[PDB]
Amino acid sequence: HMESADLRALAKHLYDSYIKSFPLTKAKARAILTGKTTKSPFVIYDMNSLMMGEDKIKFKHEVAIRIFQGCQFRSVEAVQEITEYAKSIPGFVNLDLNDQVTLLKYGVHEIIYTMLASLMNKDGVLISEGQGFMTREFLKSLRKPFGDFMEPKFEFAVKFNALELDDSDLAIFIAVIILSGDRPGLLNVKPIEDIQDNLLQALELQLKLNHPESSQLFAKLLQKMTDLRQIVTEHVQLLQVIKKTETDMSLHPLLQEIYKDL
Amino acid sequence: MESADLRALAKHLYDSYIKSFPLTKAKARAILTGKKSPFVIYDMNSLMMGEDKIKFKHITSKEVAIRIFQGCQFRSVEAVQEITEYAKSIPGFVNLDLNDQVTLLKYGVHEIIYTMLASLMNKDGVLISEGQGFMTREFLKSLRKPFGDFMEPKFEFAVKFNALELDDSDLAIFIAVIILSGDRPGLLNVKPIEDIQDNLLQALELQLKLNHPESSQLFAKLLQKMTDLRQIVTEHVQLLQVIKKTETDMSLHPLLQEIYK
Ligand SMILES: O=C(O)c1ccc(-c2nn(C(=O)c3c(Cl)cccc3C(F)(F)F)c3ccccc23)c(OCc2ccccc2)c1
Ligand SMILES: O=C(O)c1ccc(-c2nn(C(=O)c3c(Cl)cccc3C(F)(F)F)c3ccccc23)c(OCc2ccccc2)c1
Numbered sequence A: 001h002m003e004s005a006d007l008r009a010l011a012k013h014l015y016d017s018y019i020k021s022f023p024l025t026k027a028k029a030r031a032i033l034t035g036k037t038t039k040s041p042f043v044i045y046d047m048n049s050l051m052m053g054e055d056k057i058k059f060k061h062e063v064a065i066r067i068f069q070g071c072q073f074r075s076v077e078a079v080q081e082i083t084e085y086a087k088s089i090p091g092f093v094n095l096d097l098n099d100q101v102t103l104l105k106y107g108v109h110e111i112i113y114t115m116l117a118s119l120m121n122k123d124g125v126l127i128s129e130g131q132g133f134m135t136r137e138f139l140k141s142l143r144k145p146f147g148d149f150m151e152p153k154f155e156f157a158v159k160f161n162a163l164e165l166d167d168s169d170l171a172i173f174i175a176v177i178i179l180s181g182d183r184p185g186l187l188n189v190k191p192i193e194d195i196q197d198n199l200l201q202a203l204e205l206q207l208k209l210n211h212p213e214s215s216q217l218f219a220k221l222l223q224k225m226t227d228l229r230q231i232v233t234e235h236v237q238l239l240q241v242i243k244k245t246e247t248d249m250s251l252h253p254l255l256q257e258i259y260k261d262l
Numbered sequence B: 001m002e003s004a005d006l007r008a009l010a011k012h013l014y015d016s017y018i019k020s021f022p023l024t025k026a027k028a029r030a031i032l033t034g035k036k037s038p039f040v041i042y043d044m045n046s047l048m049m050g051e052d053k054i055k056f057k058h059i060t061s062k063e064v065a066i067r068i069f070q071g072c073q074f075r076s077v078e079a080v081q082e083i084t085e086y087a088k089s090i091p092g093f094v095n096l097d098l099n100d101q102v103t104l105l106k107y108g109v110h111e112i113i114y115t116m117l118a119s120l121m122n123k124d125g126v127l128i129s130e131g132q133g134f135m136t137r138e139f140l141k142s143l144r145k146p147f148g149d150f151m152e153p154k155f156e157f158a159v160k161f162n163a164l165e166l167d168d169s170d171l172a173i174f175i176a177v178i179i180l181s182g183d184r185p186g187l188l189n190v191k192p193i194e195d196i197q198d199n200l201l202q203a204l205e206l207q208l209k210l211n212h213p214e215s216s217q218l219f220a221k222l223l224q225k226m227t228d229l230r231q232i233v234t235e236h237v238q239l240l241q242v243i244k245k246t247e248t249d250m251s252l253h254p255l256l257q258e259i260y261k
Helices: A005-019 A024-033 A048-055 A065-090 A097-117 A136-138 A147-161 A168-180 A189-210 A217-245 A253-259 B003-020 B027-032 B044-054 B066-090 B097-121 B137-141 B145-162 B168-180 B189-212 B217-246 B254-259
Strands: A042-044 A126-127 A132-135 B040-042 B123-127 B133-136
Touching: A005 A065, A005 A168, A005 A189, A005 B189, A024 A097, A024 A126, A024 A147, A024 A168, A024 B217, A065 A097, A065 A147, A065 A253, A065 B066, A097 A126, A097 A132, A097 A147, A097 A168, A097 A217, A097 B145, A126 A136, A132 A136, A132 B254, A136 A147, A168 A217, A168 A253, A168 B040, A189 A217, A189 B168, A217 B217, B003 B066, B027 B097, B027 B123, B027 B168, B044 B066, B066 B097, B066 B145, B066 B168, B097 B145, B097 B168, B097 B217, B133 B137, B137 B145, B145 B217, B168 B217, B189 B217
Parallel strands: A042 A132, B040 B133
Antiparallel strands: A126 A132, B123 B133
8 A cells, every 4th residue: 555665765754753753772772782982881780880870970860769760760751752753653643632642651661662672682771871781680689579670671672682673673663553553542543553554564665675584574573562562561560569569659740641541 | 485385385274274173264154144043042041941952061060150151161171172183284383392382282272262262253242062052242241240251351352353354264374373482481492483483474474465455464463463362361361360269169070170270
């Protein structure tokens, strides 16, 4: 339902808007993680280095709570960037306004975990626009339920990163996630699915041109949407334990609204 | 992988799918749409008459809601054996590590049962006993305590899944894809499983293009349903646990408890 040139044009549009919307790309994150440059992050691996990192790293946003609350504020910034990106997806702002809210409500976390994988390897995650690197072992060692928060994200990212996607692939994949016609409470499924159909055609052609030797990469990427859904559900149940255990811990109102009745 | 090889693989699976499963989607749709009218169970009195006249096996505690629930469990155990026989016809499956064969079936059967159950359902009810009976959605949803809300999610899934309008030749490949899932926990040799799934996916993609040329990106939409299947199977497990801990009248002969574990 779309010619090849139109699908290439749509792929280029989305990549361009992705570069404009997300300040830390996978390409930059990989150049920081693979090193070979003098761009080097400060590495936080224990309590003493955290204390030194806060002195050296210029953070834009008890140790476990401090790290948790900071993650929440980074997630809110991520929602803002994802929302800016979503408005560039052709057709999205023309949808019913309640459906725009619904698509963002259920899509933003799946996108956050997708894009978080770009900042991750098996040993830890880049933080503060790549200025810092916090080890997976240090996060797993946090007290109470906080230790178990990041480990599922690392588990996903190790598998997702084996697909070797780049930002130009990811730009379309993220659009596909937002324009999901199966979100609960949608009023007008038909125009959402028509946009997703074009996005899926564009993703399929993008993966064939950019990864010609990666057989059925399109199918394998769509199957990862299953892993994303699973970790979002785990995440929601994990916060509920914190809400009942940590009663003095505030959650950001934007995050409060997203998780409500999910 | 050439097109003729993919078509050969698609036809092999369709042929085996027909032999392994007692009621095809095509035959089920002919019964459901009214095109030997099945005996209809729509309340307690018709249930009792169905057990007396048709004598439905698996629906033979004296409480009705429990009896119907256990009957779903008993049919699902029968379905597992049909799925196991079908799996053996998938090229490459029996050549896998024997523990990996068991693991793929153990973790795949719930998703496959839900998928194939949809072939037997419409928005008003479900066929039972090889299409000889039809039990209404309202009767199942009206069962007491948690049993009623146990049945309704199955219908909600099936109504959405059936909107894709797959036929048996599509489903035969799709079921094979689910079985050859390389991400099941405890697999020892993932590589040959993903190599077989890659062939099956190529065969499903081509099958869907030739069989539904007007249904844009149906391949993508069907793979997106694997998300729904995983989600409802996880929900299913939690619902069973609540029933296991709450209900005291669910006891069977210990030998039957072992069979239908
Ligand atoms: O201030 C800052 O610039 C800043 C910046 C980042 C973090 C921080 N983010 N984060 C994430 O997962 C993450 C990331 Cl990388 C990128 C995008 C979206 C997300 C999230 F949406 F998924 F959230 C973490 C996971 C584990 C630990 C930290 C992060 C951050 O953490 C708070 C913190 C860090 C160190 C010391 C004290 C507090 C702070
Ligand atoms: O023919 C067939 O392929 C087939 C296949 C499935 C059912 C049937 N299973 N089922 C379940 O809950 C279920 C499911 Cl989805 C997946 C795994 C395990 C279970 C269960 F173990 F938990 F059971 C149902 C819930 C409601 C309605 C039907 C099912 C099935 O039901 C026939 C039936 C219906 C009512 C009374 C007696 C039999 C038939």
